[PDB]
Amino acid sequence: GSSGSSGTIEARTAQSTPSAPPQKVMCVSMGSTTVRVSWVPPPADSRNGVITQYSVAYEAVDGEDRGRHVVDGISREHSSWDLVGLEKWTEYRVWVRAHTDVGPGPESSPVLVRTDEDVPSGPPRKVESGPSSG
After folding, report:
1. What is the dihedral sign for C-alpha 106, 26, 45, 11?
2. 39 with 23: CB under 8 angstroms?
3. Which CATH class is domain 12-118?
4. Which residues touch 58 (CB under 8 Å, ≥6 apart)?
């Protein structure tokens, strides 16, 4: 059996929630206690829904505090956010999604980022050869 075909036209008023987007979510540690996450905007040709607002969240994966925070009140014109109030030299899982007038969306691919280090001790150096890609 097989139910469901392809072919979605464009419309002014959002139709359904996005599936792929947000995508290409690239997060980077702005400093030591601040993080910056940016994502790619949805296409127009097949715009599942007009992003009305963006939601971001972060939680220490390898930290004492396992409290996941959530940012509210983010402009839809901002495909990026600057998190402030985290630990230094610690990894954090940032989850950014896109909400539409039709409904909320599922979390996106989490990016592990390690904030700058405080101690004068530098991280390890693991060498490795890269195969043929592309």
Report:
1. positive
2. yes
3. mainly beta
4. 35, 68, 69, 83, 86, 92, 93, 94, 95
